[PDB]
Design a protein around this ligand. Structure first.
Ligand code: BLV
Ligand code: BLV
Ligand code: BLV
Ligand code: BLV
Lengths: 173, 173, 173, 173
C-alpha cells in the first residue's frame, strides 16, 4: 500500500476517452499493491455496457478460489474526460470513487489512478492499475505504457507489481 | 504494506540478546509501511522495564497530534534469544505476537521482524522495524545496519521507509 | 563510486548465457555511479554483432551533447558462460575487462558486474549495470530484476542509481 | 563519490567560527566517499598555525602504510565566517578550494563541505567531512551532529561513510 502526506494530487485525465471501447475483459497487468487485493493472482475486470454506464465486476484468484466485487461505472461528466465514477460498496459504505484514466490508446491499454484521502490524518493512499486487453503488453501498447511511465508525474513505475497469469495462478477449482 | 504468499518464513533471531539493554526510548528510524502507522511521523517505542517484563508504549505524531498503543513485552523463552512476545490488542483480540530480533549491537540499534499470517488466503504480511536510540544512525551502528540490510535473507531494504524526525514532524500540540 | 576493502569477490555468472541475443540497444536502466559516466543521462549500449565478436558503443547525453566510447566484446571462454571480455581503452591503455552476467532472461534484461582491483592498495571498486532492451522495466523482467536484487550477495540495490530517460535528458543536438 | 547535475548549491557557513580553535589534530569520523581517499582508514588532519594561516596535513593509513598531503588553509575573508580557502595541489594544479563550515561547536567537531564544479559537464561533486577531536562522537557533540544532519539541506546522512579507528586500521608498519 502506497501512502503519502497531504491532499490528493491534481491529476490530468485524458481529454479523449472513448466510452465505446470501455467494455469486455481487461487483465490487470500491474497495480500498486492494496489491502483489498492482498494475495490475489490472475486479476481481471469485466465491463458490460448499458448506455453511458457499465456494470463492473473485478475478479482474482487465490489458491484455486475466485473472489470478486460487483458495482457500476459511469462518467463523472463528459464521456471524453477520462474521469469515471466506480460505485462500489466497501464496509457497507457505498461511495462513487473517481477513477482517472491517465493514459490510454482507446484500444489495448488503460492506466488509471484512484486516490483515497484521509481527512483526519491529512494524508492519502494512491491506487494505480495498468489494465490491458492482453495478459502481456506487446508492441505499440507496451511502447505507449513505457513512455507514459517515464514521464508520469503521478505513477511510480518501481512501485508497480505485475500480476501472475500462470495457468497455475489462474486455476479455479 | 508488504504481502507475500505462503506461511511465515523461518527466521533466525540473535542468540546473544542482552535483555538488560531492552529499555528506554527507541526511535523508529525506518520500517516497512503498515496500515496502523500510516501517515505517522517521528515514531518511537518506549520500554519501561518491570523486572520480568517491559511495558511497551509506541507513539507517533500526525499533524501536531500524538497517537499511541500500550502493551507488554517478554522473552518467548531464554532471554538471550531474540524472540520476544509483544502482547498487544488489536480489533478486540489480544495476541502474543512474536517479534524476532534479526540484528542488534545490544546498545544502539535493533532490527526486528514480525510476520502476520492469513490462514484463509494462505499468505502473510511482513512487518520490519529499524529501531535506534538515536534519531540518526551514526558510526559503527550505521555501518552495521547497512551491512545487515545488504546480506539479509528477510528484509528488502528497498521496501524500507525512513522516518521523518524534523522538528516540525515531531512537534506535538 | 563504490569502494570496498579487499580483493574482488568470486561471483557466479550465468551458465546458460545466449550469445546469440547479444546484439542491439540496451538501455542503462540502472548502475552504480562511476567517474566516467558522471553527469551522463539517458545512457545506452549498442552491441553490433560481427559473429565471433561484437562492436561495443556506449553512450550517454549530458546537456544535449552526446559522449561515447567504442570497443569490442567477446566471450572469455565458452559462449554459454556469462563472462565476457570488454576490450576498452582508458588512460591510453587497452584492457580486456571481465564483465560477469549475474542474472539474465536472455531476452529483455541483463544484470552485470565488473570489479576493478587496486593491487597496491588491496582494495576494489565495484561496477554494476542493469541493462534492458526497454527504458522501463515492465512485466516479468521487472519482477526478475527485483527478486535478483533482493537475493544478490554482490549487488546492494541501495547503491543503484536509476537513469533518466526523459525526452529532455535524451535530447541531443 | 557523490555527483549531481547543476551548479554548486548555495550553502550557509557558520558566522561564529573560532579560527583560534582551528589548530591541532582532528580525526575524520565520517565523509562522503571520494577517489582521493579510496580505501583509506583511520584518517585525520593536522592544522599548524602560521600567522593568519594554518599549515594542513591530511593523513590516512592503508595496510600499515601512511599516505598524506600537505597544503595551507586561510580564511576567505573575516575569520568569523566559516569559509576557508584550502590551497592544495592535485594533477600538477594548485587551487584555492572553498571549504564551508556548515556546523560546529568550536570545541569538539566540524561538519564541512567542498563542492567541485565541472564547467564542461555543467555538474558538481559533493565533498563532506565530519571532523572531530575525538574518534567517537559522544554527548552534546554527538547530539549536535545528529541534529544538524536532521535538517541539513545539503548533507545526506545516509551517504556518509564512517572511518575505521581499529588499532589494526590505525597500525603503521
Ligand atoms: C482489474 C482491476 C481490479 C480492481 C480495480 C478497481 N478497484 C477500484 C476501487 C477500489 N479498489 C479498492 O481496493 C478500493 C477500496 C479502498 C478502501 O476503502 O480500502 C476502491 C474504492 C477501482 C476504481 C475506483 C478500480 C479500477 N479491483 C480488483 C479486485 C478486487 N476488488 C475487490 O473488492 C475484490 C474482492 C476482494 C474480496 O472480496 O476478497 C477484488 C478481487 C481488480 C482485480
Ligand atoms: C517504535 C516502533 C513502533 C511500533 C512497533 C511495533 N508494533 C508491533 C506490533 C504490531 N504493529 C502492527 O501494526 C501490528 C498488526 C496489527 C493488525 O493486526 O493490523 C502488530 C501486531 C511490534 C511487535 C511485533 C512492534 C515492535 N509500532 C509503532 C506505532 C504504533 N502502533 C500502533 O498501534 C499505534 C497506534 C496508532 C493509532 O492508535 O492510531 C502506533 C502509533 C511504532 C512507532
Ligand atoms: C549502457 C552501459 C554503459 C557502459 C557499460 C560498461 N562499461 C564498461 C567498462 C568500464 N566502465 C568504466 O567506467 C571502466 C573503468 C575505467 C577506468 O577508470 O579505468 C570500465 C573498464 C563495461 C564493461 C564491464 C560495461 C558493460 N559504459 C557507458 C558509458 C560510457 N563509458 C565511457 O567511457 C563513456 C564516454 C565518457 C566520455 O567520453 O566522457 C560513456 C558515455 C554506458 C552508458
Ligand atoms: C581529515 C580529512 C581529510 C581530508 C580533508 C580535506 N580534503 C580537502 C580537499 C580535497 N579533497 C579531495 O579529495 C580533493 C581533490 C579533488 C580532485 O580530485 O581534484 C580536494 C580538493 C578539503 C578541503 C576542500 C578537506 C578538508 N583529506 C584527507 C586525506 C587525504 N587527502 C589526500 O590528498 C591524501 C593523499 C592521497 C595519496 O597520496 O594517495 C589523503 C590521505 C583527510 C584524511
Amino acid at each position: 500500500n502506497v501512502y503519502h502526506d497531504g491532499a490528493c494530487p491534481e491529476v490530468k485525465p485524458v481529454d479523449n476517452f472513448d466510452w465505446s471501447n470501455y467494455h469486455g475483459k481487461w487483465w490487470e497487468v500491474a497495480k500498486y499493491p492494496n489491502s483489498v487485493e492482498k494475495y490475489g493472482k490472475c486479476g481481471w475486470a469485466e465491463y458490460t455496457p448499458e448506455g453511458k454506464s457499465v456494470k463492473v465486476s473485478n475478479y482474482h484468484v487465490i489458491h484455486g478460489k475466485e473472489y470478486f466485487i460487483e458495482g457500476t461505472a459511469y462518467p463523472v461528466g463528459d464521456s471524453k474526460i477520462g474521469k469515471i465514477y466506480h460505485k462500489l460498496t466497501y464496509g457497507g459504505v457505498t461511495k462513487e470513487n473517481v477513477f482517472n484514466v491517465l493514459s490510454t490508446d482507446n484500444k489495448n491499454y488503460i492506466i488509471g489512478y484512484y486516490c483515497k484521502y484521509d481527512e483526519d490524518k491529512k494524508g492519502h493512499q494512491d491506487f494505480v492499475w495498468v489494465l490491458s486487453r492482453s495478459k502481456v503488453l506487446t508492441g505499440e501498447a507496451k511502447t505507449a505504457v513505457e513512455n507514459y511511465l517515464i514521464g508520469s508525474p503521478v505513477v511510480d513505475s518501481q512501485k508497480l507489481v505485475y500480476s501472475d497469469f500462470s495457468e497455475a495462478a489462474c486455476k479455479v477449482n
